[PDB]
Structure formats: C-alpha cells, structure tokens
Amino acid sequence: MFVNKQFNYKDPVNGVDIAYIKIPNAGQMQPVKAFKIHNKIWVIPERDTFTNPEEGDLNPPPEPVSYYDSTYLSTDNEKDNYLKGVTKLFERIYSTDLGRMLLTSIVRGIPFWGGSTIDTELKVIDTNCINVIQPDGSYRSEELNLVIIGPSADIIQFECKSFGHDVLNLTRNGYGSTQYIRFSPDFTFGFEESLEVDTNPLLGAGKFATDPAVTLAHELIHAEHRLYGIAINPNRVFKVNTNAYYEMSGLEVSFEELRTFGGHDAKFIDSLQENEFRLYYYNKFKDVASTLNKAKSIIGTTASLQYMKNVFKEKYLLSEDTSGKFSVDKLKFDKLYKMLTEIYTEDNFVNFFKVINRKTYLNFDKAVFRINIVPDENYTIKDGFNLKGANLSTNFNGQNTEINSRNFTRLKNFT
Ligand SMILES: [Ag+]
Ligand SMILES: [Ag+]
Ligand SMILES: [Ag+]
Ligand SMILES: [Ag+]
Ligand SMILES: [Zn+2]
C-alpha cells in the first residue's frame, strides 16, 4: 500500500518514478539512478558520495564504533537488494497506526517556500529539489521531502543530511528542508537484554539484534523534526550523570537524540528548557503565518498562490479567519508540536512492533551484524524477525542471534 509497485533495480528509467537524477547544491556529480517509492519520497541505492564534498572516498580514512567496507553496495544485485530491503521496511512501518501517522506527517511536511528576498513573493528554495532527467534528455525540477540513500565511508553511521541556506537555519526556523537519510537495511546492531549489561562498555557481545524497522523509524522521526523546522539546536546537550561510564568520559548527548528516543530519556530535558523550545518554535510558526499573509505573488506556475498558501496551512495546522488571514492557534500548535516530538518516538515504535530493543539511548554499542531481510523466510512486514509459525515467534527468538544464527553474521565486536 505505501509502496504500491514492485521496484527492481534494473527496471528501465521512465523519467517519472524511475530516473537518473542530480542533486542541486551537491556540486558537480554524475546522474544517479533513483526510485520514487511514494509521493515526496525517493530512494537512491548508492553509497553517499555526493551530499558532503569531502566525503567521496569510501576507503577507510586514517586511524570507536565504526565499520568500513568500500565494496558494499557496488554491484547491481546489492543495489536491488537494498531497494527491496528499504521498501519492505517502509511497509512494515506503514503497517502500524503510529507509522501511518508518521509517514503521513512526513509527506505533508513540505519544506517552506521562503526562498524569495522580497517579502511579498513566495518562492521555493533550491535546497529542496532534485533535477530529474526526462525521456527527452532535458531536466525537470522536482520538490521532494525525503531521500533514503546508502551510507558514506562509515557504513554504520546512519544520519540525516540536508543542504544549508546562506542565511536561513531551515531545520530550526520552522521552514524545514529536504532530508537525505544515510541508511542501510543490510546491517543491524546488537544489544544486550540486561539493562545493567547494555549500559556498561565492557560487557556483552550483543546477543540480540535491533529490528532495522526501528532504526529507520528513528531516522524518520529525526527527519520529520528537520522537515518541520523544529529540530533542537545541536549545542543543546545533556551532560550524562546517570551513567557512571558516561560521566567518567565526560560524554554528552544532544537533546535532539533524547527527544527522538522518548521514554525515560526525554525526561532528562527539564521543564524550563522544554517550554523554552516550545515557545521558540511557536514564535517561528507565527513568522510563517505572517509571511503567508504578506504574500501577494508566487513563482513557478506549477500551482496557484491560493493552492500553496493552503498547502502550508495544512502542514502547520494554521487557523484561517473570516478575512482569510492566517494565525497560529496555541492549542493547535501544541498538539502538532507534541505529535512530532512526544508521540513519534523510538520507544513508542517498539511498543507497536512488539520487538525487543535497547531500553535507553544512553547505552553502549556491542556489535554489528550483516543481515538479509528481503526473503520472506527471514523477515516479514508483519513480524520482522519473529515469524508467526516459526519457532521464532515467541521470546523474541527471531532477534536472538544465538537461536536464529543463520540470519546474522557478526562483522565486528565493539565491546
Ligand atoms: Ag528548486
Ligand atoms: Ag523545485
Ligand atoms: Ag535526522
Ligand atoms: Ag536521519
Ligand atoms: Zn538519532
């Protein structure tokens, strides 16, 4: 349903949902084959050597939790598997009510059209589009919200990447920007069942495997914060004082990560700072409402001013008065803000998937495993690794790398 058609890496390009594309702001690059799996969402089965200029080399840089393999995702078979793996994960996520809500929010989360220097003109920002090569060879500029792409040099460094603006802080000013998620459905992390063990850097080999659907959901949640322009400034961190090994090393974790995980982790952000951020972003939305009201012109005859004004009215859940003037209703703002920051959390997704998972973001990496979720015999949209009939359905046996040994190959231990 979420991905209505089957995609094969070798399917011929049609210039519509299967095409060679170029990422603007990415400098000079060769067109790469991409697949549009859903409205506003694309997948590029390639290692990411375009978003960051100084990150085009896949070989292990000079001399930590990291894993390198310059050959991963270099063959057509691997790219086909990557595409099928990612599509499958989106479907697993969409199969839950929470995931359906999240993906709906992501599609509705179009980056704001605030690219004009004139306050009466509404214009798209080039950081939020890709250039799509058409059958006739010409290019077609297309707006999009999300792009799933292969990892860069460090295979296990999953993260959101987005292009910046000269002056605008798009991921924190309420505007939002297109997010490129480096991710792989072909590897997963190992964790320990015991809290005392999982949060200790010297113990555990990583007996249980993280369900990659949770990992992708985690990145999607993080991406949606950036899409709605309410990501917490990275300089806002928590000087961990709840873990003796974190304090010992003076390690710090950004509020953004704690918020994304949810559960008890989010409670580390004290009430004052919580209100501070909410007030801040409430004001940013008011700014978007004013800009819309001040808009009398629009660029790009792909839609009318009335249409786009309404698109953002929906995205930001703004209120329109009798005169057709937009404003931000505190109740509505608080509702949307809470949905994006408290309802969509890693902890809540675990409850929906019914999988075993780390209990806190404040733990220690144990290991990385190679996996293959494409075959139904190994992983299904409905149960992940814990197959219904199989003897893998209970006690999370499917995620148990010792019992379900054939589905996991430990590549590196971090403990
Ligand atoms: Ag553009
Ligand atoms: Ag565009
Ligand atoms: Ag992110
Ligand atoms: Ag991300
Ligand atoms: Zn994160």
Side-chain angles (χ1 to χ4, degrees):
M1 185 78 98
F2 191 73
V3 182
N4 213 310
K5 60 198 301 180
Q6 70 179 67
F7 282 113
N8 293 305
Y9 184 68
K10 293 173 182 175
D11 289 334
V13 300
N14 52 43
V16 175
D17 60 335
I18 303 175
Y20 277 93
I21 66 83
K22 296 185 63 178
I23 297 168
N25 301 187
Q28 209 68 43
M29 72 175 278
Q30 186 181 305
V32 294
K33 196 176 185 178
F35 306 73
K36 181 186 185 179
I37 67 172
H38 192 93
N39 183 45
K40 303 293 185 177
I41 301 173
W42 292 72
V43 177
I44 301 171
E46 298 278 334
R47 291 293 288 282
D48 177 18
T49 51
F50 338 90
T51 65
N52 191 174
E54 298 63 64
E55 291 192 291
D57 188 303
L58 296 186
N59 299 77
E63 287 296 304
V65 180
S66 66
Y67 178 69
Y68 296 81
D69 177 9
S70 63
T71 70
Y72 169 59
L73 212 53
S74 63
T75 59
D76 284 344
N77 181 43
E78 287 178 286
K79 292 181 185 179
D80 188 65
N81 205 66
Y82 176 101
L83 182 59
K84 290 178 165 59
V86 172
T87 290
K88 190 166 191 175
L89 292 183
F90 268 96
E91 296 286 7
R92 179 155 164 67
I93 288 171
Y94 199 65
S95 80
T96 64
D97 277 354
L98 184 60
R100 182 192 71 192
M101 300 167 67
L102 167 61
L103 292 173
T104 293
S105 291
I106 288 175
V107 174
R108 286 167 61 97
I110 297 173
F112 189 58
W113 280 35
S116 170
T117 39
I118 308 177
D119 74 60
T120 178
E121 189 176 68
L122 214 55
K123 184 178 190 179
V124 62
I125 297 176
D126 62 52
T127 67
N128 310 317
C129 310
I130 52 174
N131 287 160
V132 183
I133 299 185
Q134 309 176 297
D136 67 337
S138 70
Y139 289 71
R140 186 177 86 267
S141 181
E142 189 178 316
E143 299 180 68
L144 72 177
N145 298 352
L146 184 69
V147 175
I148 307 296
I149 191 176
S152 189
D154 188 350
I155 286 180
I156 58 180
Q157 180 60 196
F158 299 167
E159 64 198 318
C160 269
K161 278 297 190 302
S162 63
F163 296 102
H165 183 280
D166 302 47
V167 187
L168 282 10
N169 298 307
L170 304 178
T171 68
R172 302 195 299 278
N173 74 344
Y175 284 25
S177 59
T178 298
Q179 298 301 306
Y180 291 74
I181 310 186
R182 290 173 176 180
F183 170 81
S184 170
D186 303 305
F187 299 94
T188 192
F189 313 76
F191 65 96
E192 292 289 325
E193 340 69 89
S194 294
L195 190 285
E196 199 146 47
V197 178
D198 205 38
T199 60
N200 192 107
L202 307 174
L203 272 11
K207 183 172 180 171
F208 286 91
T210 298
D211 186 323
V214 172
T215 305
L216 176 58
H218 181 93
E219 294 309 313
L220 295 171
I221 294 165
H222 213 256
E224 43 112 41
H225 293 165
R226 297 162 69 80
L227 272 172
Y228 282 77
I230 64 170
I232 298 178
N233 193 313
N235 64 31
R236 286 294 186 137
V237 299
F238 174 42
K239 291 177 182 178
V240 183
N241 58 181
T242 296
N243 186 302
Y245 299 83
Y246 268 64
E247 289 186 295
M248 179 189 294
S249 305
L251 301 168
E252 303 176 306
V253 179
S254 66
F255 279 177
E256 183 54 37
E257 294 298 350
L258 300 181
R259 159 171 291 182
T260 296
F261 181 88
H264 185 258
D265 286 17
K267 301 185 189 310
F268 286 127
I269 300 169
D270 61 73
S271 290
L272 268 76
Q273 305 195 70
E274 178 101 298
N275 298 299
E276 177 190 351
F277 302 139
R278 179 160 49 222
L279 235 288
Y280 186 77
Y281 295 116
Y282 167 61
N283 292 313
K284 292 305 181 186
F285 275 41
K286 293 189 304 170
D287 290 326
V288 174
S290 70
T291 294
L292 295 172
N293 295 320
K294 288 165 55 192
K296 303 303 172 186
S297 186
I298 190 174
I299 313 302
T301 66
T302 63
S304 58
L305 180 59
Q306 171 196 183
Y307 191 83
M308 292 313 295
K309 271 188 170 185
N310 187 61
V311 172
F312 294 114
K313 170 185 175 172
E314 294 168 48
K315 173 181 179 181
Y316 300 108
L317 294 181
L318 307 175
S319 294
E320 174 171 45
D321 67 23
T322 292
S323 291
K325 212 71 177 181
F326 294 121
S327 62
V328 189
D329 179 305
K330 236 304 183 182
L331 199 67
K332 289 179 176 177
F333 172 79
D334 280 5
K335 180 180 295 178
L336 175 64
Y337 185 72
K338 189 174 98 164
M339 180 70 65
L340 300 166
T341 67
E342 301 177 67
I343 291 72
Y344 306 156
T345 66
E346 183 176 323
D347 194 53
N348 283 334
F349 269 103
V350 168
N351 289 323
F352 279 77
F353 292 135
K354 255 284 184 180
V355 294
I356 184 178
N357 193 76
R358 61 186 171 189
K359 303 296 187 180
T360 178
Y361 184 83
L362 300 172
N363 65 341
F364 288 89
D365 297 291
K366 305 302 176 182
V368 60
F369 302 87
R370 179 79 178 307
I371 60 177
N372 182 13
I373 68 176
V374 177
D376 281 359
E377 58 151 359
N378 298 343
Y379 186 102
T380 63
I381 290 172
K382 273 66 184 192
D383 306 314
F385 289 116
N386 309 313
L387 319 182
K388 296 176 189 308
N391 70 303
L392 303 177
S393 59
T394 59
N395 302 307
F396 309 110
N397 286 333
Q399 287 173 272
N400 188 311
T401 65
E402 294 185 62
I403 295 176
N404 191 14
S405 45
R406 60 282 177 49
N407 267 287
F408 307 97
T409 291
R410 186 179 288 176
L411 300 178
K412 183 175 177 180
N413 190 288
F414 300 124
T415 298

PDB file of all heavy atoms in Angstrom, residues 158-161 180-181 219-220 222-223, ligand 4:
ATOM      1  N   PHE A 158      24.465   6.091  10.469  1.00  0.00           N
ATOM      2  CA  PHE A 158      23.185   6.489   9.890  1.00  0.00           C
ATOM      3  C   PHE A 158      22.873   7.888  10.396  1.00  0.00           C
ATOM      4  O   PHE A 158      23.016   8.175  11.588  1.00  0.00           O
ATOM      5  CB  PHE A 158      22.069   5.524  10.306  1.00  0.00           C
ATOM      6  CG  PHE A 158      22.290   4.100   9.867  1.00  0.00           C
ATOM      7  CD1 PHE A 158      21.503   3.074  10.389  1.00  0.00           C
ATOM      8  CD2 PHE A 158      23.268   3.780   8.928  1.00  0.00           C
ATOM      9  CE1 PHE A 158      21.686   1.750   9.985  1.00  0.00           C
ATOM     10  CE2 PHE A 158      23.459   2.463   8.517  1.00  0.00           C
ATOM     11  CZ  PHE A 158      22.664   1.444   9.048  1.00  0.00           C
ATOM     12  N   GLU A 159      22.446   8.764   9.497  1.00  0.00           N
ATOM     13  CA  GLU A 159      22.165  10.132   9.900  1.00  0.00           C
ATOM     14  C   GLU A 159      21.485  10.922   8.794  1.00  0.00           C
ATOM     15  O   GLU A 159      21.535  10.543   7.622  1.00  0.00           O
ATOM     16  CB  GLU A 159      23.479  10.820  10.266  1.00  0.00           C
ATOM     17  CG  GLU A 159      24.429  10.938   9.081  1.00  0.00           C
ATOM     18  CD  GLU A 159      25.868  11.205   9.488  1.00  0.00           C
ATOM     19  OE1 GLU A 159      26.091  12.022  10.413  1.00  0.00           O
ATOM     20  OE2 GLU A 159      26.779  10.601   8.871  1.00  0.00           O
ATOM     21  N   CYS A 160      20.857  12.026   9.184  1.00  0.00           N
ATOM     22  CA  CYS A 160      20.187  12.909   8.242  1.00  0.00           C
ATOM     23  C   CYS A 160      21.172  13.935   7.722  1.00  0.00           C
ATOM     24  O   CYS A 160      21.998  14.452   8.470  1.00  0.00           O
ATOM     25  CB  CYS A 160      19.051  13.672   8.916  1.00  0.00           C
ATOM     26  SG  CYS A 160      17.445  12.885   8.836  1.00  0.00           S
ATOM     27  N   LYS A 161      21.078  14.218   6.434  1.00  0.00           N
ATOM     28  CA  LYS A 161      21.915  15.219   5.801  1.00  0.00           C
ATOM     29  C   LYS A 161      20.960  16.121   5.025  1.00  0.00           C
ATOM     30  O   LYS A 161      19.991  15.646   4.440  1.00  0.00           O
ATOM     31  CB  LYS A 161      22.927  14.564   4.852  1.00  0.00           C
ATOM     32  CG  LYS A 161      24.192  14.008   5.530  1.00  0.00           C
ATOM     33  CD  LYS A 161      25.000  15.131   6.186  1.00  0.00           C
ATOM     34  CE  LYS A 161      26.369  14.663   6.661  1.00  0.00           C
ATOM     35  NZ  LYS A 161      26.283  13.537   7.643  1.00  0.00           N
ATOM     36  N   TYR A 180      18.115  13.963   3.510  1.00  0.00           N
ATOM     37  CA  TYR A 180      18.751  12.820   2.882  1.00  0.00           C
ATOM     38  C   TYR A 180      19.194  11.914   4.018  1.00  0.00           C
ATOM     39  O   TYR A 180      20.061  12.291   4.799  1.00  0.00           O
ATOM     40  CB  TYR A 180      19.971  13.257   2.064  1.00  0.00           C
ATOM     41  CG  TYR A 180      19.617  14.053   0.832  1.00  0.00           C
ATOM     42  CD1 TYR A 180      19.182  15.377   0.932  1.00  0.00           C
ATOM     43  CD2 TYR A 180      19.651  13.464  -0.429  1.00  0.00           C
ATOM     44  CE1 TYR A 180      18.783  16.091  -0.198  1.00  0.00           C
ATOM     45  CE2 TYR A 180      19.250  14.162  -1.563  1.00  0.00           C
ATOM     46  CZ  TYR A 180      18.815  15.473  -1.438  1.00  0.00           C
ATOM     47  OH  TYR A 180      18.360  16.147  -2.545  1.00  0.00           O
ATOM     48  N   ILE A 181      18.604  10.727   4.114  1.00  0.00           N
ATOM     49  CA  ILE A 181      18.955   9.797   5.186  1.00  0.00           C
ATOM     50  C   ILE A 181      19.918   8.707   4.734  1.00  0.00           C
ATOM     51  O   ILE A 181      19.576   7.905   3.867  1.00  0.00           O
ATOM     52  CB  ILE A 181      17.707   9.082   5.756  1.00  0.00           C
ATOM     53  CG1 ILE A 181      16.621  10.107   6.094  1.00  0.00           C
ATOM     54  CG2 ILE A 181      18.098   8.274   6.987  1.00  0.00           C
ATOM     55  CD1 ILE A 181      15.403   9.490   6.797  1.00  0.00           C
ATOM     56  N   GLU A 219      15.383   7.295  12.410  1.00  0.00           N
ATOM     57  CA  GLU A 219      15.869   8.312  11.489  1.00  0.00           C
ATOM     58  C   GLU A 219      14.716   9.128  10.895  1.00  0.00           C
ATOM     59  O   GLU A 219      14.834  10.338  10.740  1.00  0.00           O
ATOM     60  CB  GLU A 219      16.709   7.678  10.367  1.00  0.00           C
ATOM     61  CG  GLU A 219      18.018   7.038  10.845  1.00  0.00           C
ATOM     62  CD  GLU A 219      18.859   7.969  11.713  1.00  0.00           C
ATOM     63  OE1 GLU A 219      19.044   9.137  11.330  1.00  0.00           O
ATOM     64  OE2 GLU A 219      19.350   7.537  12.780  1.00  0.00           O
ATOM     65  N   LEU A 220      13.606   8.471  10.562  1.00  0.00           N
ATOM     66  CA  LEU A 220      12.445   9.182  10.003  1.00  0.00           C
ATOM     67  C   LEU A 220      11.893  10.206  11.002  1.00  0.00           C
ATOM     68  O   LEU A 220      11.478  11.306  10.613  1.00  0.00           O
ATOM     69  CB  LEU A 220      11.342   8.189   9.623  1.00  0.00           C
ATOM     70  CG  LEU A 220      11.670   7.211   8.488  1.00  0.00           C
ATOM     71  CD1 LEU A 220      10.569   6.166   8.375  1.00  0.00           C
ATOM     72  CD2 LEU A 220      11.820   7.968   7.183  1.00  0.00           C
ATOM     73  N   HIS A 222      13.593  11.746  13.338  1.00  0.00           N
ATOM     74  CA  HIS A 222      14.612  12.793  13.369  1.00  0.00           C
ATOM     75  C   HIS A 222      14.455  13.671  12.130  1.00  0.00           C
ATOM     76  O   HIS A 222      14.554  14.898  12.209  1.00  0.00           O
ATOM     77  CB  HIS A 222      16.005  12.147  13.398  1.00  0.00           C
ATOM     78  CG  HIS A 222      17.023  12.924  14.175  1.00  0.00           C
ATOM     79  ND1 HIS A 222      18.009  13.679  13.571  1.00  0.00           N
ATOM     80  CD2 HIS A 222      17.215  13.053  15.509  1.00  0.00           C
ATOM     81  CE1 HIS A 222      18.765  14.236  14.501  1.00  0.00           C
ATOM     82  NE2 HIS A 222      18.304  13.871  15.685  1.00  0.00           N
ATOM     83  N   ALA A 223      14.185  13.025  10.995  1.00  0.00           N
ATOM     84  CA  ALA A 223      13.993  13.715   9.727  1.00  0.00           C
ATOM     85  C   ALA A 223      12.744  14.580   9.761  1.00  0.00           C
ATOM     86  O   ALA A 223      12.739  15.691   9.225  1.00  0.00           O
ATOM     87  CB  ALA A 223      13.886  12.709   8.590  1.00  0.00           C
TER      88      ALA A 223
HETATM   89 AG    AG B   4      18.454  10.771   9.961  1.00  0.00          AG
END
